[PDB]
Design a protein around this nucleic acid. Structure first.
Ligand code: SF4
Length: 1118
DNA sequence: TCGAATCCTGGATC
DNA sequence: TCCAGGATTCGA
């Protein structure tokens, strides 16, 4: 171990060497300094006693370019419980047993959560242990844990030690929790000298923030035609990097036909950067010149795009050929988890953020689309085939293409990413790297621990999953879940602000509105506005108008009228529900606990109970039969992980094989023994939610809720101040106000994201605070509110669409919608209020409001308040110009969200369900889809809308029948092809056949075994016809064949069809034309014809026929 | 002959 | 990280 420690000291020395190369010279001198706490790492440090001890390492940057590092020693600890009266004796045992291997032992009382008679104020002991090094702590934990395990199986001296807690918190987190240290604040640090620890203090009077230098790059390489490049055999053609707004380019003049002149490029005036070209006589000197320039630049942050698959692996695999090592020059390296990470600068990557937090629709994640959407311009693309040749004949064009991804990457990172990561990281104590890479699961627990810590609460141990949980009746379960909410389209069609439609409204329904109007408007003012009604100058006038309009509604219960459209949305419903009932993961107490809580006395108001729906899924085997098969397994013998190891009795096996062996044998038992093997069961359970557990969780959510609204307020203020800076045009003020605006914008979004995360954690597998019932109560009662709204709205008018958290609906144009009250209050003389909002925000109030909120008055008194609180509110979006909602071809099928809607300005304001296509898609259908939406804006009434549609939709179906011979021949390939690409290598597929596999086979005879010989394949193909009735999987032929030499093309065409005598050989004859007509027929069916028939319009295309079921229904009804 | 139940493999921006 | 889509098997 001493040699291992010496190796760790060598690692330390090497890291100090690199930090010196990057100017992160350690602090040595007594004094105080101020700086920005950019990054931190763990490292172990030798003390003045020459004992190696664990430490953490903090990196700072000044307001100038100077930089420094400081290190803190701090001994980790973990807790063990005890049986009664053991603590002193057990302490003497441990200190005898582990002398020199534990540093200190201590007795501390703590707030348990599960201790009976909890809230009277009792608490239990724990023992704290302290260690010099994490190695020794690990080794002692490995020794200790089995002795607890044996006791839990029962549930010398070690038999008395019962439990242990917080044994697995990452060490570099621990410090930040204990010392309140957090990143991207300003800090002030003083070093007294080695006789003292460093003293470190947070600032909060400084808000202006420094700017780190930022660099990004991209790399362009050779490849061989029709395969992926080889890390060992391909070579580099050009490399380009953008830094602080200046572009640099380098290129391989041994490959490029001519050297490149320095030039300039800008897609939009925002994106300023020009470029400059270095040039070199050989490839190796490219990489040497790169590493020299980056060493001289010594930049702190380094942004790439998808740094896993390609770039760093490539530059590494072509370092060794010339004896280079970036792991010496820059000091980057791979790590056990697979990614690249480095001692002193942090590798950062937009793609993780795009995946995790963009909310862009699926399949738009491809770089060009994401850039276009966020940055608002179209970057241009060349086919990766053509680019390799183009190098030979027009270099300037290739350089002008390749440069673009530098600019796009740099500005994407700066404008969107860089405000977000640090701002969010101001709240949550991890490193800027982990918070970007981590999922939203672990992150929220990494916050929540802070609160649990300062409340002095001992953490629970991880909720490791059980195996084959037995049911209450003794059935073997396989799974459990809460019954979800659902989404469906209630009806389908097209709707517009200006085309007549029909309604029936129940004539008695409006009565239940008109008899409550005044109260409702009172609530609408007093609940939301909080302006006293005594300020209102015209309260009666508007109510009298509304009454008259509701009377006009009652006068004609069924009507022909133009429709409105609105979207009703319960913004952030789930957090509000959690705030509304005092749900806490600790507080869903069982009933048995109320056998002991001294507060459970007659007149107790504190019990509150709610119901949720649970799903079982279980096999039919009875409890005695599982034991009967166990008594068969008791005889059996199994091979261990290596058959060279001794064969194991069932006693010796690990659980993860036992469980599968018994489960499969019980399954094969049932498969014969019972007629059906899985039972699915729904059951309704009633749970009690303890109203008086410690409040810290809800107080956390409340704090975040209110802070978000404060920051949105300040963001609005600063956006106004920015508008004033734009008017004044003073660059200094523009700089200041824009930097404030972006700061608040980022911090506001960050709080939104974390607040949405607060729901998703509590269901996650293995989470520390886990409880199925937290999903149950909140989800079910949430869906229950939607049913109330649906039941209310369907009497007034048809609901079109029913979201997870909202509704789309029509209302009749005559229905009252929006009003202005007038008042004396100079703060707000007149106020606008929307009538559906008032209706919903009163209807929810009567049922949902909570009568049972409680809160503690004085810890020593145990006097408690009673209170009521509510925070569900509906919100109204609309109107919208037009809406389209397609329907699936099948009889009565259910759906998933698919719709579109349009703004009055003609923008496609929202769409959903029209995915960007997984696995690739034909171009023709793509153009058809985007084209047809253009038609719907035109037309007078129902017939004329389709009169517009048909005179565009016909245009393609004519082209396919005609073959449009006038069209240039290459465009058909552009118009019909598929680019489906595959990842395995041919022999990985085995004895199998598929369009891809058959393509892989047929292609090879063009050029040989090379394309099978190495991994992955990419191709383009079309469907052949003449071998009719063999399925399409066999009929595909690769496009490449057309380009081949005429006699070879003849030979293979005469082979691949089994065609004996063919004389005509061109795509016009050979295409399986009408297969693509079927592709068209199966599109145009679902978007147009079915909708048109569903609302009784003539079949809008003679060429296509209704699916037979629809025809038989339509003929029966007419 | 016709309808329902069960077990299986793939998905990642490429 | 499990949902969705097709093929196989059993009942009437
Ligand atoms: S229901 Fe009442 S008595 Fe029972 S644990 Fe909760 S607060 Fe205590």
């Amino acid at each position: 171990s001493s040699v291992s420690a010496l190796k760790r000291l060598e690692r330390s020395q090497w890291t100090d060497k690199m930090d010196l190369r990057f100017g992160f010279e350690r602090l040595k001198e007594p004094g105080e300094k101020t700086g920005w706490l950019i990054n931190m790492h763990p490292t172990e440090i030798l003390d003045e006693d020459k004992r190696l001890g664990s430490a953490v390492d903090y990196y700072f940057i000044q307001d100038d370019g100077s930089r420094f590092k400081v290190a803190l020693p701090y001994k980790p600890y973990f807790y063990i419980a005890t049986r009664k009266g053991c603590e002193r004796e057990v302490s003497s045992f441990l200190s005898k047993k582990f002398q020199g291997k534990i540093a200190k032992v201590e007795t501390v009382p703590k707030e348990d959560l599960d201790l009976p008679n909890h809230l009277v104020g009792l608490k239990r002991n724990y023992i704290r242990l302290s260690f010099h090094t994490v190695e020794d702590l690990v080794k002692v934990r490995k020794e200790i844990s089995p002795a607890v395990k044996k006791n839990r199986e029962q549930d010398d001296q070690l038999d008395n030690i019962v439990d242990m807690r917080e044994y697995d918190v990452p060490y570099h987190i621990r410090l930040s929790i204990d010392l309140k240290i957090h990143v991207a604040h300003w800090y002030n640090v003083r070093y007294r000298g080695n006789a003292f620890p460093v003293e470190i203090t947070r600032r909060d009077d400084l808000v202006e923030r420094p700017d780190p230098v930022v660099l990004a790059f991209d790399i362009e390489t050779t490849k061989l035609p029709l395969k992926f490049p080889d890390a060992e055999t391909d070579q580099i053609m050009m490399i380009s990097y953008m830094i602080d707004g200046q572009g640099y380019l380098i290129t391989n003049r041994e490959i490029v036909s001519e050297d490149i002149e320095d030039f300039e490029f800008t897609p939009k005036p925002e994106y300023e950067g020009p470029f400059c070209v270095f040039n070199e006589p050989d490839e190796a000197h490219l990489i040497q010149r790169w590493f020299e320039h980056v060493q001289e630049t010594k930049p702190t942050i380094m942004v790439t795009y998808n740094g896993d698959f390609f770039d760093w692996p490539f530059v590494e695999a072509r370092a060794a050929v010339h004896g280079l090592s970036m792991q010496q020059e820059i000091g980057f390296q791979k790590d056990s988890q697979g990614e690249y990470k480095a001692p002193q600068c942090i590798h950062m990557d937009c793609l993780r953020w795009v995946k995790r937090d963009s909310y862009l629709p699926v399949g738009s994640h491809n770089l060009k689309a994401a850039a276009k959407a966020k940055l608002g311009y179209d970057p241009v693309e060349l086919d990766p085939e053509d680019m390799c040749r183009m190098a030979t004949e027009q270099p300037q064009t290739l350089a002008t293409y390749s440069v673009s991804d530098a600019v796009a990457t740099y500005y994407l990172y700066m404008k969107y990413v860089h405000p977000f990561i640090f701002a969010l990281c101001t709240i949550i104590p991890m490193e800027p790297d982990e918070v970007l890479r981590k999922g939203s699961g672990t992150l929220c627990e990494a916050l929540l621990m802070v609160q649990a810590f300062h409340a002095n609460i001992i953490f629970p141990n991880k909720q490791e999953q059980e195996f084959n949980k037995l049911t209450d009746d003794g059935h073997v379960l396989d799974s459990e879940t809460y019954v979800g909410g659902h989404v469906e389209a209630l009806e389908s069609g097209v709707f517009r602000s200006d085309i007549p439609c029909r309604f029936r409204m129940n004539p008695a329904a409006f009565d239940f509105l008109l008899q409550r109007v005044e109260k409702t408007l009172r609530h609408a003012l007093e609940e939301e506005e909080k302006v006293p009604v005594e300020q209102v100058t015209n309260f009666e006038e508007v109510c009298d108008e509304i009454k008259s309009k509701l009377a006009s509604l009652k006068d004609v219960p069924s009507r022909i009228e133009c429709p409105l459209i609105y979207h009703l949305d319960v913004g952030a419903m789930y957090p509000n529900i959690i705030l509304t009932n005092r749900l806490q993961p600790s507080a869903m107490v069982d009933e048995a606990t109320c056998a002991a809580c001294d507060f459970n006395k007659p007149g107790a108001n504190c019990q509150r109970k709610m119901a949720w729906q649970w799903r079982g899924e279980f096999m039919p085997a009875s409890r005695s039969e599982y034991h009967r098969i166990q008594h068969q397994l008791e005889s059996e013998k199994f091979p261990p992980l290596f058959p060279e190891g001794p064969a194991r009795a069932f006693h010796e096996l690990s659980r993860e094989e036992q469980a599968k062996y018994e489960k499969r044998r019980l399954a094969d038992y049932c498969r014969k023994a019972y007629k059906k093997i899985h039972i699915t069961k729904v059951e309704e359970r009633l749970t009690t939610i303890c109203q008086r557990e410690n409040s810290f969780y809800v107080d956390t959510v409340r704090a975040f809720r209110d802070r978000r609204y404060e920051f949105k307020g300040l963001h609005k203020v600063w956006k106004k101040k920015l508008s004033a800076a734009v008017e004044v045009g003073d660059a200094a003020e523009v700089k200041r106000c824009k930097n404030m605006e972006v700061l608040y914008d980022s911090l506001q979004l960050a709080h939104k994201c974390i607040l949405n995360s607060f729901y998703g954690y509590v269901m996650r597998k293995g989470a520390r605070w886990y409880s199925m019932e937290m999903a149950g109560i909140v989800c079910f009662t949430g869906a229950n509110i939607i049913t109330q709204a649906r039941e209310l709205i369907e009497q007034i008018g048809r609901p079109l669409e029913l979201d997870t958290d909202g509704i789309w609906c029509v209302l009749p144009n005559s229905f009252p919608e929006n009003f202005v009250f007038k008042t004396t209050n100079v703060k707000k003389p007149k106020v606008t209020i929307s009538y559906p909002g008032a209706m919903l925000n009163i209807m929810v109030k009567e049922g949902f409001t909570n009568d049972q909120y409680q809160e503690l008055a004085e810890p020593s008194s145990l006097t408690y308040v009673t209170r009521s609180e509510n925070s569900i509110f509906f919100e109204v979006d609309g109107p919208y110009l037009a809406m389209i909602l397609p329907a699936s071809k099948e009889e009565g099928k259910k759906l998933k969200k698919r719709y579109a809607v349009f703004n009055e300005d003609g923008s496609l304001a929202e769409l959903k369900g029209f995915e960007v296509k997984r696995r690739g898609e034909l171009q023709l259908i793509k153009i058809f889809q985007s084209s047809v939406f253009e038609a719907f804006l035109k037309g007078s009434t129902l017939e004329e809308v389709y009169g517009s549609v048909a005179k565009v939709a016909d245009y393609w179906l004519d082209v396919l029948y005609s073959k449009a011979a006038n069209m240039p021949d290459s465009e058909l390939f552009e118009l019909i092809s598929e680019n489906r690409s595959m990842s395995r290598k041919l022999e990985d597929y085995g004895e199998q056949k598929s369009t891809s596999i058959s393509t892989a086979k047929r292609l090879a005879e063009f050029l040989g075994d090379q394309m099978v010989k190495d991994a992955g394949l990419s191709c383009r193909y079309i469907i052949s016809r003449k071998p009719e009735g063999s399925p399409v999987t066999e009929r595909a032929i690769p496009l490449a064949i057309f380009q081949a030499e005429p006699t070879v093309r003849k030979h293979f065409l005469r082979k691949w069809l089994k065609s004996s005598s063919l004389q005509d050989f061109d795509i016009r004859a050979i295409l399986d034309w009408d297969y693509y007509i079927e592709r068209l027929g199966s599109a145009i069916q679902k978007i147009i014809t079915i909708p048109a028939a569903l609302q009784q319009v003539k079949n809008p295309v003679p060429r296509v026929k209704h699916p037979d079921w629809l025809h038989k229904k339509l003929l029966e009804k007419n």
